[PDB]
Amino acid sequence: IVGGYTCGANTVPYQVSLNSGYHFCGGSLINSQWVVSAAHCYKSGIQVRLGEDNINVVEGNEQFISASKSIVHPSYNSNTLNNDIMLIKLKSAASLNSRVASISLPTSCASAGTQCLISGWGNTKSSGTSYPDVLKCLKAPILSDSSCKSAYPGQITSNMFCAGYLEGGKDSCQGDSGGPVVCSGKLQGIVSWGSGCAQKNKPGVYTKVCNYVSWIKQTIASN
Ligand SMILES: NC(=[NH2+])c1ccc2[nH]c(-c3cccc(-c4ccccc4)c3[O-])nc2c1
Ligand SMILES: [Ca+2]
Ligand SMILES: [Cl-]
């Protein structure tokens, strides 16, 4: 997260770190046995790490659970990143408490102007690599579709939305992919892509979760 602030330990109880010997993507806990992340974060050997704050120190509250299966959306396109969503089933259920809690799926999509919270352990520099130990947060608004399409002509599908600041300075960045964009307590987006990080007129692009709720529900119900 570039230009964000330190969240504070366990203040984002639904945030998870996907780990394969190092942190490579974020994700969101939506119930005790399932996590939602981005399809492009897929790989085998994923260990989901819940209740984390400093990802390099065991401070207590952590639960390390292996993924039993990862389900990439069948229509995911790696060239356009359209349908960049994945569901991860955990080998065993997580113990939910105040430090580990799930987030709710939305009932309706959000409107431009809605302020959301984006979090993650990704890079904090736009020009260079500085990876934090603790979780970073950024409050950012959803932009209108015209500003988004005007920023990325021909690359935005109906399953994406832009959130951020056109002046540059604040944005999600590498290491944050797969993580949550929560607005009014509902998971509205998943960190997907962007051009550089925090550059002027190049906002972050997110997967529009409101468009996949029946898919998530049906998929979970059958697995
Ligand atoms: N500017 C942004 N809002 C942004 C957000 C998420 C990103 N994630 C990345 C990213 C960059 C290189 C590699 C990966 C990657 C690729 C495969 C697996 C895991 C991560 C990224 O997510 N850049 C990103 C840029
Ligand atoms: Ca830790
Ligand atoms: Cl267009």
Short mmCIF file of all heavy atoms in Angstrom, two decimals, residues 64-124:
data_model
loop_
_atom_site.label_atom_id
_atom_site.label_comp_id
_atom_site.label_asym_id
_atom_site.label_seq_id
_atom_site.Cartn_x
_atom_site.Cartn_y
_atom_site.Cartn_z
N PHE A 64 -2.41 -20.87 11.05
CA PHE A 64 -1.77 -21.22 9.75
C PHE A 64 -2.53 -22.48 9.32
O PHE A 64 -2.45 -23.51 9.97
CB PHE A 64 -0.26 -21.58 9.93
CG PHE A 64 0.63 -20.39 10.27
CD1 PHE A 64 1.97 -20.63 10.44
CD2 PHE A 64 0.17 -19.09 10.40
CE1 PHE A 64 2.84 -19.62 10.74
CE2 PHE A 64 1.06 -18.07 10.70
CZ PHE A 64 2.39 -18.34 10.87
N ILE A 65 -3.25 -22.37 8.23
CA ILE A 65 -4.05 -23.51 7.72
C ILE A 65 -3.70 -23.72 6.25
O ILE A 65 -3.57 -22.77 5.51
CB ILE A 65 -5.56 -23.16 7.92
CG1 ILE A 65 -5.76 -22.78 9.42
CG2 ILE A 65 -6.43 -24.36 7.51
CD1 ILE A 65 -7.25 -22.46 9.74
N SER A 66 -3.57 -24.94 5.84
CA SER A 66 -3.25 -25.22 4.42
C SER A 66 -4.55 -25.16 3.59
O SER A 66 -5.63 -25.43 4.09
CB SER A 66 -2.67 -26.63 4.27
OG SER A 66 -1.48 -26.57 5.06
N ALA A 67 -4.39 -24.81 2.35
CA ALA A 67 -5.57 -24.73 1.45
C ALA A 67 -5.88 -26.17 1.05
O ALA A 67 -4.94 -26.91 0.84
CB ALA A 67 -5.21 -23.93 0.22
N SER A 68 -7.12 -26.55 0.94
CA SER A 68 -7.47 -27.92 0.55
C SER A 68 -7.60 -27.83 -0.98
O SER A 68 -7.22 -28.77 -1.65
CB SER A 68 -8.79 -28.31 1.21
OG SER A 68 -8.74 -29.72 1.28
N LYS A 69 -8.15 -26.77 -1.52
CA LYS A 69 -8.28 -26.63 -3.01
C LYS A 69 -8.46 -25.16 -3.30
O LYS A 69 -8.94 -24.45 -2.43
CB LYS A 69 -9.50 -27.40 -3.59
CG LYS A 69 -10.80 -27.14 -2.80
CD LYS A 69 -12.03 -27.48 -3.71
CE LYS A 69 -12.01 -28.91 -4.27
NZ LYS A 69 -13.21 -29.10 -5.12
N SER A 70 -8.07 -24.77 -4.47
CA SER A 70 -8.20 -23.35 -4.88
C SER A 70 -9.04 -23.49 -6.13
O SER A 70 -8.74 -24.35 -6.93
CB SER A 70 -6.85 -22.78 -5.21
OG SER A 70 -6.05 -22.97 -4.04
N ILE A 71 -10.04 -22.69 -6.27
CA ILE A 71 -10.96 -22.72 -7.45
C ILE A 71 -10.86 -21.41 -8.23
O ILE A 71 -11.47 -20.42 -7.85
CB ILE A 71 -12.43 -22.96 -6.95
CG1 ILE A 71 -12.47 -24.26 -6.14
CG2 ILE A 71 -13.42 -23.05 -8.15
CD1 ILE A 71 -13.88 -24.58 -5.64
N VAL A 72 -10.10 -21.42 -9.29
CA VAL A 72 -9.94 -20.19 -10.14
C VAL A 72 -11.25 -20.08 -10.96
O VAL A 72 -11.80 -21.08 -11.40
CB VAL A 72 -8.71 -20.37 -11.05
CG1 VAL A 72 -8.71 -19.39 -12.25
CG2 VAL A 72 -7.44 -20.20 -10.17
N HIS A 73 -11.73 -18.89 -11.17
CA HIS A 73 -12.98 -18.73 -11.96
C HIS A 73 -12.72 -19.35 -13.36
O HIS A 73 -11.69 -19.09 -13.95
CB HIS A 73 -13.29 -17.22 -12.04
CG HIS A 73 -14.68 -17.01 -12.64
ND1 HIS A 73 -14.88 -17.12 -13.94
CD2 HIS A 73 -15.86 -16.71 -11.98
CE1 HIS A 73 -16.16 -16.90 -14.08
NE2 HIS A 73 -16.73 -16.66 -12.94
N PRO A 74 -13.62 -20.16 -13.88
CA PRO A 74 -13.43 -20.90 -15.18
C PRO A 74 -13.20 -19.95 -16.38
O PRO A 74 -12.56 -20.31 -17.35
CB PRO A 74 -14.69 -21.74 -15.33
CG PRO A 74 -15.27 -21.86 -13.91
CD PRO A 74 -14.96 -20.48 -13.29
N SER A 75 -13.72 -18.76 -16.28
CA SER A 75 -13.56 -17.77 -17.38
C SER A 75 -12.46 -16.73 -17.10
O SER A 75 -12.44 -15.66 -17.68
CB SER A 75 -14.90 -17.04 -17.61
OG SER A 75 -15.82 -18.11 -17.81
N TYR A 76 -11.58 -17.05 -16.20
CA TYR A 76 -10.48 -16.11 -15.89
C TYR A 76 -9.61 -16.01 -17.16
O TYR A 76 -9.30 -17.03 -17.75
CB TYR A 76 -9.66 -16.68 -14.71
CG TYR A 76 -8.31 -15.98 -14.57
CD1 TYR A 76 -8.23 -14.62 -14.34
CD2 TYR A 76 -7.15 -16.71 -14.64
CE1 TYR A 76 -7.00 -14.02 -14.18
CE2 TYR A 76 -5.92 -16.11 -14.48
CZ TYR A 76 -5.85 -14.76 -14.25
OH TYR A 76 -4.64 -14.16 -14.07
N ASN A 77 -9.26 -14.80 -17.53
CA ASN A 77 -8.41 -14.54 -18.73
C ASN A 77 -7.13 -13.92 -18.17
O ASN A 77 -7.18 -12.82 -17.67
CB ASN A 77 -9.11 -13.53 -19.66
CG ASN A 77 -8.24 -13.28 -20.89
OD1 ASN A 77 -7.04 -13.05 -20.83
ND2 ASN A 77 -8.75 -13.31 -22.07
N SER A 78 -6.03 -14.58 -18.27
CA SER A 78 -4.77 -14.01 -17.72
C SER A 78 -4.20 -12.85 -18.49
O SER A 78 -3.32 -12.16 -18.00
CB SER A 78 -3.78 -15.12 -17.64
OG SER A 78 -3.78 -15.67 -18.95
N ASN A 79 -4.69 -12.65 -19.68
CA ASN A 79 -4.17 -11.53 -20.51
C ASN A 79 -4.91 -10.26 -20.20
O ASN A 79 -4.33 -9.21 -20.25
CB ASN A 79 -4.34 -11.80 -22.05
CG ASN A 79 -3.50 -13.02 -22.43
OD1 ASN A 79 -2.29 -12.98 -22.47
ND2 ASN A 79 -4.08 -14.14 -22.71
N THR A 80 -6.17 -10.36 -19.92
CA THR A 80 -6.96 -9.13 -19.60
C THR A 80 -7.26 -8.95 -18.10
O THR A 80 -7.59 -7.86 -17.67
CB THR A 80 -8.28 -9.20 -20.36
OG1 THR A 80 -8.93 -10.39 -19.90
CG2 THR A 80 -8.02 -9.52 -21.83
N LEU A 81 -7.12 -10.05 -17.39
CA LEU A 81 -7.36 -10.21 -15.93
C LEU A 81 -8.85 -10.07 -15.69
O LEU A 81 -9.30 -9.69 -14.62
CB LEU A 81 -6.59 -9.14 -15.07
CG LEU A 81 -5.08 -9.43 -15.05
CD1 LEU A 81 -4.41 -8.45 -14.06
CD2 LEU A 81 -4.75 -10.87 -14.60
N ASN A 82 -9.60 -10.40 -16.70
CA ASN A 82 -11.08 -10.31 -16.54
C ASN A 82 -11.39 -11.59 -15.73
O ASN A 82 -10.79 -12.62 -15.96
CB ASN A 82 -11.76 -10.35 -17.92
CG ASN A 82 -13.27 -10.11 -17.78
OD1 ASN A 82 -13.74 -9.28 -17.03
ND2 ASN A 82 -14.13 -10.80 -18.46
N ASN A 83 -12.30 -11.45 -14.80
CA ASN A 83 -12.78 -12.52 -13.86
C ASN A 83 -11.60 -12.93 -12.97
O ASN A 83 -11.29 -14.09 -12.74
CB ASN A 83 -13.32 -13.77 -14.59
CG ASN A 83 -14.46 -13.40 -15.49
OD1 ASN A 83 -15.50 -12.98 -15.05
ND2 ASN A 83 -14.34 -13.54 -16.77
N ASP A 84 -10.93 -11.94 -12.46
CA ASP A 84 -9.76 -12.23 -11.58
C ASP A 84 -10.24 -12.48 -10.12
O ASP A 84 -10.12 -11.66 -9.24
CB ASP A 84 -8.81 -11.05 -11.63
CG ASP A 84 -7.41 -11.31 -11.02
OD1 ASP A 84 -7.05 -12.46 -10.84
OD2 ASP A 84 -6.77 -10.31 -10.76
N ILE A 85 -10.80 -13.64 -9.92
CA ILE A 85 -11.30 -14.03 -8.60
C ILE A 85 -11.03 -15.54 -8.46
O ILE A 85 -11.10 -16.30 -9.41
CB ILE A 85 -12.85 -13.64 -8.54
CG1 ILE A 85 -13.41 -13.99 -7.16
CG2 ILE A 85 -13.66 -14.34 -9.63
CD1 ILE A 85 -14.87 -13.48 -7.02
N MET A 86 -10.73 -15.92 -7.26
CA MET A 86 -10.44 -17.32 -6.87
C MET A 86 -10.99 -17.56 -5.46
O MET A 86 -11.02 -16.66 -4.64
CB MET A 86 -8.91 -17.48 -6.93
CG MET A 86 -8.34 -18.66 -6.19
SD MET A 86 -6.58 -18.83 -6.50
CE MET A 86 -5.87 -17.67 -5.30
N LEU A 87 -11.40 -18.76 -5.23
CA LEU A 87 -11.94 -19.14 -3.90
C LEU A 87 -10.95 -20.19 -3.37
O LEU A 87 -10.49 -21.02 -4.13
CB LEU A 87 -13.30 -19.83 -3.97
CG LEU A 87 -14.42 -18.85 -4.41
CD1 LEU A 87 -15.73 -19.66 -4.59
CD2 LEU A 87 -14.65 -17.85 -3.29
N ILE A 88 -10.67 -20.16 -2.10
CA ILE A 88 -9.74 -21.14 -1.50
C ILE A 88 -10.47 -21.83 -0.38
O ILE A 88 -11.05 -21.15 0.46
CB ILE A 88 -8.49 -20.43 -0.94
CG1 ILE A 88 -7.81 -19.61 -2.08
CG2 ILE A 88 -7.52 -21.47 -0.37
CD1 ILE A 88 -6.59 -18.82 -1.56
N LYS A 89 -10.43 -23.13 -0.37
CA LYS A 89 -11.11 -23.84 0.71
C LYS A 89 -9.99 -24.18 1.68
O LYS A 89 -8.89 -24.52 1.27
CB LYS A 89 -11.74 -25.10 0.16
CG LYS A 89 -12.72 -25.58 1.25
CD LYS A 89 -13.42 -26.84 0.84
CE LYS A 89 -14.52 -27.06 1.89
NZ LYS A 89 -15.14 -28.40 1.69
N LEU A 90 -10.26 -24.08 2.96
CA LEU A 90 -9.21 -24.39 3.99
C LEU A 90 -9.36 -25.87 4.39
O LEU A 90 -10.48 -26.39 4.42
CB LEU A 90 -9.42 -23.53 5.26
CG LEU A 90 -9.45 -22.01 4.94
CD1 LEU A 90 -9.59 -21.24 6.25
CD2 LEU A 90 -8.17 -21.61 4.29
N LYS A 91 -8.24 -26.47 4.69
CA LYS A 91 -8.19 -27.91 5.10
C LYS A 91 -9.10 -28.04 6.33
O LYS A 91 -9.86 -28.98 6.41
CB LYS A 91 -6.71 -28.28 5.40
CG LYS A 91 -6.61 -29.81 5.50
CD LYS A 91 -5.16 -30.32 5.75
CE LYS A 91 -4.32 -30.30 4.45
NZ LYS A 91 -3.01 -31.00 4.68
N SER A 92 -9.01 -27.16 7.29
CA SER A 92 -9.91 -27.27 8.48
C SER A 92 -10.48 -25.87 8.68
O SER A 92 -9.95 -24.91 8.17
CB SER A 92 -9.11 -27.69 9.71
OG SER A 92 -8.06 -26.74 9.76
N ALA A 93 -11.54 -25.76 9.41
CA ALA A 93 -12.13 -24.43 9.63
C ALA A 93 -11.28 -23.64 10.59
O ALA A 93 -10.62 -24.21 11.44
CB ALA A 93 -13.52 -24.62 10.19
N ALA A 94 -11.34 -22.34 10.44
CA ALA A 94 -10.57 -21.41 11.32
C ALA A 94 -11.39 -21.14 12.58
O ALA A 94 -12.61 -21.27 12.49
CB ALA A 94 -10.37 -20.08 10.62
N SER A 95 -10.77 -20.78 13.69
CA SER A 95 -11.57 -20.50 14.93
C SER A 95 -11.82 -19.01 14.77
O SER A 95 -10.85 -18.27 14.73
CB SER A 95 -10.74 -20.74 16.22
OG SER A 95 -10.10 -22.00 16.05
N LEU A 96 -13.05 -18.62 14.68
CA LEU A 96 -13.35 -17.19 14.51
C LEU A 96 -13.47 -16.64 15.92
O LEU A 96 -13.89 -17.33 16.83
CB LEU A 96 -14.66 -17.06 13.75
CG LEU A 96 -14.54 -17.75 12.38
CD1 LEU A 96 -15.81 -17.54 11.56
CD2 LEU A 96 -13.32 -17.21 11.60
N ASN A 97 -13.08 -15.42 16.08
CA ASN A 97 -13.10 -14.70 17.38
C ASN A 97 -13.07 -13.22 17.03
O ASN A 97 -13.48 -12.85 15.94
CB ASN A 97 -11.86 -15.15 18.20
CG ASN A 97 -10.53 -15.02 17.43
OD1 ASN A 97 -10.13 -13.95 17.01
ND2 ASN A 97 -9.80 -16.07 17.21
N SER A 98 -12.59 -12.37 17.89
CA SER A 98 -12.57 -10.92 17.52
C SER A 98 -11.39 -10.59 16.60
O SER A 98 -11.47 -9.62 15.87
CB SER A 98 -12.49 -10.07 18.84
OG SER A 98 -11.59 -10.71 19.75
N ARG A 99 -10.36 -11.39 16.66
CA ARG A 99 -9.15 -11.15 15.82
C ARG A 99 -9.22 -11.85 14.48
O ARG A 99 -8.46 -11.47 13.61
CB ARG A 99 -7.85 -11.65 16.54
CG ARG A 99 -7.32 -10.61 17.59
CD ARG A 99 -8.20 -10.47 18.84
NE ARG A 99 -7.46 -11.09 19.96
CZ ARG A 99 -7.92 -12.15 20.57
NH1 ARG A 99 -8.53 -13.09 19.90
NH2 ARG A 99 -7.74 -12.22 21.86
N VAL A 100 -10.05 -12.83 14.35
CA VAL A 100 -10.17 -13.54 13.07
C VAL A 100 -11.68 -13.53 12.89
O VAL A 100 -12.37 -14.14 13.68
CB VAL A 100 -9.54 -14.98 13.23
CG1 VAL A 100 -9.67 -15.80 11.90
CG2 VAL A 100 -8.03 -14.84 13.53
N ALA A 101 -12.16 -12.85 11.89
CA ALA A 101 -13.62 -12.77 11.63
C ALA A 101 -13.85 -12.75 10.12
O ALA A 101 -12.97 -12.35 9.41
CB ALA A 101 -14.15 -11.50 12.24
N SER A 102 -14.99 -13.14 9.63
CA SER A 102 -15.15 -13.10 8.16
C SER A 102 -15.80 -11.77 7.80
O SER A 102 -16.26 -11.07 8.69
CB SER A 102 -16.03 -14.26 7.74
OG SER A 102 -17.17 -14.20 8.59
N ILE A 103 -15.83 -11.45 6.54
CA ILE A 103 -16.46 -10.18 6.09
C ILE A 103 -17.68 -10.62 5.24
O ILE A 103 -17.66 -11.70 4.67
CB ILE A 103 -15.35 -9.38 5.31
CG1 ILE A 103 -15.82 -7.98 4.87
CG2 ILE A 103 -14.77 -10.14 4.10
CD1 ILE A 103 -16.10 -7.17 6.13
N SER A 104 -18.69 -9.79 5.17
CA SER A 104 -19.89 -10.12 4.39
C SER A 104 -19.77 -9.78 2.92
O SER A 104 -19.09 -8.84 2.53
CB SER A 104 -21.10 -9.34 4.93
OG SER A 104 -21.22 -9.83 6.26
N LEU A 105 -20.44 -10.56 2.15
CA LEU A 105 -20.46 -10.38 0.67
C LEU A 105 -21.53 -9.30 0.49
O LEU A 105 -22.43 -9.20 1.30
CB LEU A 105 -20.91 -11.69 -0.05
CG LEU A 105 -19.84 -12.78 0.05
CD1 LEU A 105 -20.41 -14.07 -0.55
CD2 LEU A 105 -18.59 -12.36 -0.77
N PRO A 106 -21.45 -8.50 -0.53
CA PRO A 106 -22.47 -7.44 -0.75
C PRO A 106 -23.80 -7.95 -1.36
O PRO A 106 -23.88 -9.02 -1.94
CB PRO A 106 -21.74 -6.46 -1.64
CG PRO A 106 -20.83 -7.37 -2.51
CD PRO A 106 -20.39 -8.51 -1.57
N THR A 107 -24.81 -7.17 -1.20
CA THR A 107 -26.15 -7.50 -1.73
C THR A 107 -26.36 -6.62 -2.96
O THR A 107 -27.21 -6.93 -3.78
CB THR A 107 -27.18 -7.23 -0.63
OG1 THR A 107 -26.69 -6.16 0.18
CG2 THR A 107 -27.19 -8.44 0.30
N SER A 108 -25.62 -5.55 -3.07
CA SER A 108 -25.72 -4.64 -4.21
C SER A 108 -24.32 -4.10 -4.45
O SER A 108 -23.49 -4.14 -3.56
CB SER A 108 -26.68 -3.53 -3.83
OG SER A 108 -26.17 -3.09 -2.57
N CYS A 109 -24.09 -3.61 -5.63
CA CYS A 109 -22.77 -3.05 -5.98
C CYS A 109 -22.69 -1.65 -5.35
O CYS A 109 -23.71 -1.08 -5.00
CB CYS A 109 -22.67 -2.92 -7.49
SG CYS A 109 -22.91 -4.45 -8.41
N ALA A 110 -21.50 -1.14 -5.24
CA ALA A 110 -21.31 0.20 -4.65
C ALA A 110 -21.27 1.26 -5.73
O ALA A 110 -20.97 0.97 -6.88
CB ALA A 110 -20.02 0.25 -3.91
N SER A 111 -21.55 2.45 -5.32
CA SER A 111 -21.57 3.60 -6.22
C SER A 111 -20.29 4.38 -6.15
O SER A 111 -19.54 4.31 -5.19
CB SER A 111 -22.77 4.47 -5.82
OG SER A 111 -23.90 3.63 -6.09
N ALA A 112 -20.08 5.10 -7.20
CA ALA A 112 -18.87 5.95 -7.28
C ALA A 112 -18.93 6.85 -6.05
O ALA A 112 -20.01 7.22 -5.61
CB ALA A 112 -18.93 6.78 -8.57
N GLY A 113 -17.81 7.20 -5.51
CA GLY A 113 -17.86 8.08 -4.32
C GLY A 113 -17.83 7.26 -3.06
O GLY A 113 -17.42 7.80 -2.06
N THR A 114 -18.25 6.02 -3.08
CA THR A 114 -18.20 5.22 -1.83
C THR A 114 -16.72 5.15 -1.38
O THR A 114 -15.83 4.93 -2.18
CB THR A 114 -18.75 3.83 -2.12
OG1 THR A 114 -20.10 4.04 -2.54
CG2 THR A 114 -18.93 3.04 -0.82
N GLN A 115 -16.51 5.32 -0.10
CA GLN A 115 -15.17 5.31 0.53
C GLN A 115 -15.02 3.87 1.02
O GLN A 115 -15.95 3.35 1.61
CB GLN A 115 -15.19 6.31 1.70
CG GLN A 115 -13.82 6.91 2.03
CD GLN A 115 -13.40 7.86 0.90
OE1 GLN A 115 -14.22 8.49 0.26
NE2 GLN A 115 -12.14 8.01 0.62
N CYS A 116 -13.87 3.31 0.75
CA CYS A 116 -13.55 1.90 1.14
C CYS A 116 -12.18 1.82 1.78
O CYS A 116 -11.38 2.74 1.67
CB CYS A 116 -13.58 1.06 -0.09
SG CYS A 116 -15.05 1.21 -1.14
N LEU A 117 -11.97 0.70 2.41
CA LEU A 117 -10.68 0.40 3.11
C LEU A 117 -10.02 -0.73 2.35
O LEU A 117 -10.64 -1.77 2.17
CB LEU A 117 -10.95 -0.06 4.55
CG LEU A 117 -9.64 -0.33 5.32
CD1 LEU A 117 -8.98 0.98 5.67
CD2 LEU A 117 -9.96 -1.05 6.63
N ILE A 118 -8.80 -0.47 1.99
CA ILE A 118 -7.93 -1.42 1.23
C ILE A 118 -6.76 -1.67 2.20
O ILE A 118 -6.25 -0.73 2.79
CB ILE A 118 -7.45 -0.72 -0.06
CG1 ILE A 118 -8.72 -0.15 -0.79
CG2 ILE A 118 -6.69 -1.74 -0.95
CD1 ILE A 118 -8.34 0.75 -1.97
N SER A 119 -6.37 -2.91 2.33
CA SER A 119 -5.25 -3.26 3.23
C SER A 119 -4.30 -4.30 2.64
O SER A 119 -4.64 -5.00 1.70
CB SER A 119 -5.83 -3.78 4.55
OG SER A 119 -6.95 -4.62 4.23
N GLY A 120 -3.13 -4.40 3.20
CA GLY A 120 -2.18 -5.42 2.66
C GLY A 120 -0.74 -5.18 3.08
O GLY A 120 -0.40 -4.15 3.64
N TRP A 121 0.06 -6.16 2.78
CA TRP A 121 1.52 -6.18 3.10
C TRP A 121 2.36 -5.97 1.86
O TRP A 121 3.50 -6.40 1.79
CB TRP A 121 1.91 -7.52 3.70
CG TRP A 121 1.37 -7.70 5.12
CD1 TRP A 121 1.96 -7.19 6.24
CD2 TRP A 121 0.28 -8.42 5.48
NE1 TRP A 121 1.19 -7.62 7.22
CE2 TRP A 121 0.14 -8.37 6.87
CE3 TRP A 121 -0.65 -9.14 4.73
CZ2 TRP A 121 -0.90 -9.05 7.49
CZ3 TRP A 121 -1.70 -9.82 5.34
CH2 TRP A 121 -1.83 -9.78 6.74
N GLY A 122 1.81 -5.29 0.90
CA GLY A 122 2.55 -5.04 -0.37
C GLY A 122 3.46 -3.84 -0.26
O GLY A 122 3.49 -3.13 0.72
N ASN A 123 4.16 -3.67 -1.33
CA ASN A 123 5.14 -2.57 -1.47
C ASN A 123 4.56 -1.20 -1.06
O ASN A 123 3.40 -0.90 -1.36
CB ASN A 123 5.57 -2.60 -2.93
CG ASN A 123 6.76 -1.70 -3.18
OD1 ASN A 123 7.46 -1.27 -2.29
ND2 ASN A 123 7.04 -1.37 -4.40
N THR A 124 5.36 -0.41 -0.38
CA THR A 124 4.93 0.94 0.08
C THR A 124 5.63 2.06 -0.75
O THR A 124 5.39 3.22 -0.48
CB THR A 124 5.28 1.06 1.61
OG1 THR A 124 6.66 0.72 1.68
CG2 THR A 124 4.65 -0.07 2.44
#
